[PDB]
Design a protein around this ligand. Structure first.
Ligand SMILES: [Mg+2]
Ligand SMILES: [Mg+2]
Ligand SMILES: [Mg+2]
Ligand SMILES: [Mg+2]
Ligand SMILES: [Mg+2]
Ligand SMILES: [Mg+2]
Ligand SMILES: [Mg+2]
Ligand SMILES: [Mg+2]
Ligand SMILES: [Mg+2]
Ligand SMILES: [Mg+2]
Ligand SMILES: [Mg+2]
Lengths: 192, 154, 125, 150, 105, 67, 93, 143
RNA sequence: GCUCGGCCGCACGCGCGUUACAAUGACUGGCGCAAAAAGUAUUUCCUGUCCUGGGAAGGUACGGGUAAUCUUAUUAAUACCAGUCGUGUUAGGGAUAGUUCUUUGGAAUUGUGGAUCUUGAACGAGGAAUUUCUAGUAAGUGCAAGUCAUCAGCUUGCGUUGAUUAU
């Protein structure tokens, strides 16, 4: 039988419509269908292993990233589970089919390469890769959570939850994530 | 819980204790901490002596509860409290025990440094000039005259 | 209208009590801080006793003309004894001897606590 | 059927035995106890008032598993870290007063026993026939209640 | 038959030599008729570590010498009489190789 | 926000450029509504293999160099 | 009311909503029965969000409702309390 | 002479050592002498059941598997307790069943996860006097 | 050689670091997970069991080891479950300081270290700059060993938890 996520979230409840992300994500594999986002896997070894990482394992990783406070996946797996419960209680959708969308949206499609010649700082038009795109997307999403999450009674599992939602919506006023997603392209569309 | 009945009056936002000790409305033990003499754990002790509710908010205690504390501090040893939980123990070669009050404490010190100012002991002289006594290292330590000795909140 | 710690006399009877043997009778013991009690209850020296008597003669022989004979010592480790009050002992610090008038307050405290061992810093450049 | 403590998360069991000693109040909360004195060297005094019962409560669970364990060891085995402030945290030993009492009391209760055989730890505490039976009952009672959560 | 359980202990600063005694002690004991030998057992190799700051005067970067002295202890058990042992100990064992013996019944 | 995101995939990974030694130059093939098939030589940044798919927000480009 | 040191300073002028630690008997019941007021999901935060009630207080209000078979717990951790108002939030005054 | 009907399989992960004994019975799961339901990280508990489910209540129901683990860290042990199960279920079928049934389960697990049969090679890496840690070093002011 | 001072003296200027600004947290309680090191001539070294103290620490009541045999196959801490606090320089943080008690040492006063109750400062994530760092690696987290009578915020090692980005 099908191993649901956290015990209650069918993986086959999602599909990657765009071809871009098809190989640069995890929902799709048999091996990916995990109960727990903890694999102590050995990704990050070859030069593209990162791929085969169950999308959420990646989220958890990028999540335990602030110095002193972090470095302990144990907990982070939690902050992500609660956040999924919370995302569900609002749109009652398969929260992976949410987080997933968000991942696809929050990734800038264009960036500018700083190429300076003798003091002058010029830039060019650059198209952002897929692996890079997803990486940026998650990094971004989480990046923001902490932003508000600080001296706030709002919790990461809440901040994050509230983020993954709007990040899927493209709501440019409710996602520190998509703000840059747009600006980076905009500024980049200027330098180009 | 916090199932108050007569809001604005069935409660007292600020209580008066030992002179300038005004109290905050949150939790009782902790509220006590503002008193220059009681702290994190001493407050908790107090509530076990006066059988007063700890978990319960602050200010849900009448003047009886207030005096229970003013005198509890005047001769603490009387209600019990082992000699070793007190702030002051065996003073000036005679005075047995006390419990450094918000105002008592302030002057007790003014008298001991005075006790030493006249004596002219190293540790004594140190306080006068204004320099750590035990913390010894002066090279890098507290520069731009940071907080010397004896500290008062403001 | 000023008084003294625990009664300067009670102690002269407390120290020179029935058994005025060891400079610090177990009586005075109850009075001192743990560190001091530690030392005496541990192993205090005898030299500290002949130094004692040296102040003794200085306190009496001197007329009420309040001119005490300064007693010199390196025993900066000595903890002022009750009967040691009133005399002016010269204590070495590093350079010379320091003359200090012993007040009732400096008892139980180390005799060294008054012989400044270094001149703190003045400044300019 | 039947179940032993090894079949019940004791974090759950102690929450049970702590009380079996309450209703029965076979004990007698010593003096220094209520007298506020958190275990070891920490910040605030415990919060739950029956900590006295809980401590022993588990102490039984501990001895039922590690027979012959000692005072200074349980003292460690409880698990404590110390914020010395600037100096990093060092591991800390517990309190020998509350601890040694609890063993004496559990012995008066006919649950603990002082072995006078093993020449290594002569007089270490161990479960007793009557003593350990009492435990499995609490355990099985809890065990059966867990299986009862249809 | 006055059987005495003999304990052969061998401790040595280097493996080269201690392995020869061990290897040959057994080689020799198996070949006697009044003999019963418990295989040569190798205790855990103890290592004494000494880390030292190279240079004498504390100048130049940090240089550390990690010096080691390994001590291998091998233990052999024997079923024999008192003469039997002195018969098998008649080797030509290297220097610095301590051999201790325990006799029980 | 009405963009003309034509999806194109990687035909051949040319070389690396921008002395920032991190940018990659790639030959593309398109698959979208507008045209399709048209081949371009665009400049990527980031992890990219042969055959991936990249959303170009401007088909009128194709800077290039190979020395 | 404010004696704090070198804290004021260019930036946010956000008045800290005055949460309360007391609830009058005139509102006690009325509020407990009205869970559908604090959004669909109820966490230590949301509760404070709509009612000006600090977590510590909010919890009891949660456990209370949890007790009155009115609310169900989703997950309970350190500071993460996930509660669902049984039946569905269908209260609009 | 004797000869119990038993299998001895082990799992390991950065010092974590899993002693797994498999004898035929009615589906017992002992870990250090207790039921899986009580492992420390209530979370990772699932990790251990992954093999069980991945195969089917079938194989688990027929046998009694007792494991003892005294590895290093909470997480690691779990990985070994995991690896022992997987190795044992397979190890059982080798000498006590058709060598073909073993191949089925082996690929079965291998396909889902290698950490059940393979051994997480990496260990810790020793420090160096070059600095404060294994690869970090004392600051270096240049200017 | 001896007695007593000093190298720690303070307006300040540099350089390693330690702790932290807190709810991805603090405090109370519960929870058999580790590695590597060490250890005596009689009591003098590791110290288990037991007794006494609120506590640090005592006693000598019963004991093993000059070591895969004894301190130990365990006494780590982060982590995990429960509970209290609930944005509040609050105490997060713990500097400074005041009696008391305890251990090392003839001696600690220019606080050896440790315990207790108070006191409770800057700090609200840090300018110009600038250092290491690609995997069981960074980081966090404790444990050892050197020094050592007593003193680690240093050093040399050890393990647990464990990732972003590159190739
Ligand atoms: Mg704890
Ligand atoms: Mg926590
Ligand atoms: Mg002892
Ligand atoms: Mg040891
Ligand atoms: Mg509090
Ligand atoms: Mg303190
Ligand atoms: Mg002093
Ligand atoms: Mg100190
Ligand atoms: Mg460290
Ligand atoms: Mg030592
Ligand atoms: Mg040391």
């Amino acid at each position: 039988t099908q191993p649901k996520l956290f015990g209650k979230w069918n993986y086959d409840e999602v599909k990657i419509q765009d071809p871009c992300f098809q190989n640069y994500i995890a929902c799709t594999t048999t091996k990916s269908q995990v109960f727990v986002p903890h694999t102590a896997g050995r990704y990050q070894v070859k030069k593209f292993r990162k791929t085969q990482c169950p999308i959420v394992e990646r989220l958890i990783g990028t999540l335990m990233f602030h110095g002193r406070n972090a470095g302990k996946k144990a907990l982070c797996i939690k902050v992500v589970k609660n956040a999924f419960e919370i995302i569900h209680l609002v749109t009652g959708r398969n929260p992976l089919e949410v987080f997933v969308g968000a991942v696809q949206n929050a990734g800038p499609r264009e960036d500018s390469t700083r190429i300076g010649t003798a003091g002058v700082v010029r830039k060019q038009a650059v198209d952002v890769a897929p692996m890079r795109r997803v990486n940026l997307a998650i990094y971004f999403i989480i990046k923001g959570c902490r932003e508000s999450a600080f001296k706030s009674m709002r919790s990461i599992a809440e901040t994050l939850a509230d983020e993954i939602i709007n990040a899927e919506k493209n709501n440019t006023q409710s996602s520190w994530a998509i703000r840059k997603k747009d600006e980076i392209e905009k500024v980049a569309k200027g330098n180009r | 819980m916090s199932f108050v009945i007569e809001k604005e009056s069935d409660f007292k936002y600020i209580h008066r204790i030992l002179n300038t000790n005004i109290d905050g409305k949150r939790i009782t033990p902790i509220a006590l901490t503002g008193i220059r003499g009681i702290g994190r754990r001493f407050a908790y002790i107090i509530c076990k002596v006066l059988k007063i509710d700890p978990n319960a908010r602050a200010g849900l205690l009448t003047e009886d509860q207030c005096n229970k504390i003013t005198d509890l501090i005047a001769d603490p040893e009387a209600h019990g409290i082992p000699t070793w939980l007190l702030n002051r123990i065996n003073d000036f070669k005679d005075g047995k025990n006390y419990q450094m009050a918000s105002n008592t404490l302030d002057t007790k010190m003014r008298e001991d440094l005075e006790r030493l100012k006249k004596i002219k002991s190293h540790r004594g002289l140190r306080h006068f000039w204004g320099l750590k006594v035990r913390g010894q290292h002066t090279k890098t330590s507290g520069r731009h005259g940071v907080v010397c000795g004896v500290v008062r909140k403001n | 209208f000023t008084f003294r710690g625990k009664g300067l006399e009670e102690l002269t009877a407390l120290a020179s009590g029935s058994n005025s043997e060891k400079l610090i009778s177990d009586e005075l013991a109850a009075l001192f801080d743990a560190k001091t009690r530690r030392r005496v209850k541990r192993g205090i020296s005898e030299k500290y006793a002949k130094f004692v008597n040296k102040v003794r003669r200085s306190k009496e022989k001197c007329p009420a003309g309040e001119k005490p004979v300064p007693v010199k010592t390196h025993y900066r480790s000595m903890i002022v004894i009750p009967e040691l009050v009133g005399g002016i002992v010269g204590v070495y610090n590093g350079k010379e001897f320091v003359n200090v008038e012993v007040k009732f307050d400096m008892i139980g405290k180390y005799l060294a606590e008054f012989a400044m061992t270094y001149k703190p810093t003045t400044h300019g450049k | 059927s039947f179940f032993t403590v090894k079949d019940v998360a004791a974090a759950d069991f102690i929450r049970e035995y702590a009380s079996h000693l309450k209703k029965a109040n076979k004990l007698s909360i010593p003096e220094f106890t209520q007298w506020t004195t958190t275990s070891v060297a920490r910040e605030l005094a415990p919060q739950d008032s029956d900590w006295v019962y809980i401590r022993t409560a588990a102490l039984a669970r501990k001895v039922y598993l590690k027979p012959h364990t000692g005072i200074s060891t349980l003292k460690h085995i409880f698990g404590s870290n110390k914020d010395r402030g600037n100096l990093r945290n060092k591991h800390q030993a517990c309190h020998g007063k509350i601890l040694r009492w609890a063993l004496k009391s559990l012995e008066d209760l006919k649950i603990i026993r002082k072995d006078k055989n093993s020449a290594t730890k002569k007089f270490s505490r161990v479960i007793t026939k009557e003593g350990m039976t009492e435990l499995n009952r609490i355990a099985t009672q809890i065990a059966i209640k867990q299986r009862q959560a249809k | 038959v006055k059987k005495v359980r003999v304990r052969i202990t061998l401790t040595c600063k280097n493996l080269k030599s201690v392995e020869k005694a061990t290897s040959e002690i057994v080689s020799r004991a198996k070949k006697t008729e009044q003999v019963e030998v418990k295989g040569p057992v190798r205790m855990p190799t103890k290592t004494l570590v000494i880390t030292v700051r190279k240079s004498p005067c504390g100048e130049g970067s940090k240089t550390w010498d990690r010096f080691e002295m390994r001590i291998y202890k091998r233990i052999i058990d024997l079923t024999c009489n008192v003469p039997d042992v002195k018969t098998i100990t008649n080797f030509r064992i290297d220097p610095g190789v301590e051999i201790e013996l325990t006799m029980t019944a | 926000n009405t963009e003309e995101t034509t999806k194109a995939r990687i035909m051949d990974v040319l070389g690396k450029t921008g002395s920032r030694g991190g940018i990659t130059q790639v030959r593309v093939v398109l698959i979208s509504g507008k045209e399709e098939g048209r081949q371009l030589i665009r400049n990527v940044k980031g992890a990219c293999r042969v055959g991936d798919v990249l959303e170009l927000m401007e088909c009128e480009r194709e800077a290039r160099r190979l020395r | 009311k404010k004696g704090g040191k070198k804290k004021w300073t260019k930036g946010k002028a956000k008045d800290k909503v005055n949460h309360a630690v007391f609830i009058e008997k005139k509102n006690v019941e009325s509020i407990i029965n009205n869970p559908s007021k604090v959004g669909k999901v109820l966490t230590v935060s949301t509760v404070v969000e709509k009612l000006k009630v600090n977590g510590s207080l909010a919890r009891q209000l949660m456990r209370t409702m949890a007790d009155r078979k009115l609310v169900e717990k989703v997950a309970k951790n350190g500071n993460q309390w996930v509660y669902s108002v049984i039946g569905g939030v269908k209260e609009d005054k | 002479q004797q000869k119990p009907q038993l299998v001895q399989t082990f799992g390991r992960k950065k010092n974590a050592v899993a002693v797994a004994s498999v004898r035929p019975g009615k589906g017992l799961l002992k870990v250090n002498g207790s039921p899986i339901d009580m492992i420390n990280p209530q979370i990772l508990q699932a990790k251990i059941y992954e093999p069980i489910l991945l195969l089917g209540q079938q194989k688990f129901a027929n046998l009694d598997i007792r494991i003892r683990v005294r590895g290093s860290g909470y997480t690691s042990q779990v990985y070994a307790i995991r690896q022992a199960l997987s190795k044992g279920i397979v190890a059982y079928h080798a000498k006590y069943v058709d060598e073909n049934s073993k191949r089925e389960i082996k690929e079965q697990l291998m396909q889902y996860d290698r950490s059940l049969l393979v051994a997480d090679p990496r260990r810790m890496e020793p420090k160096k006097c070059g600095g404060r840690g294994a690869r970090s070093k004392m600051q270096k002011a240049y200017r």
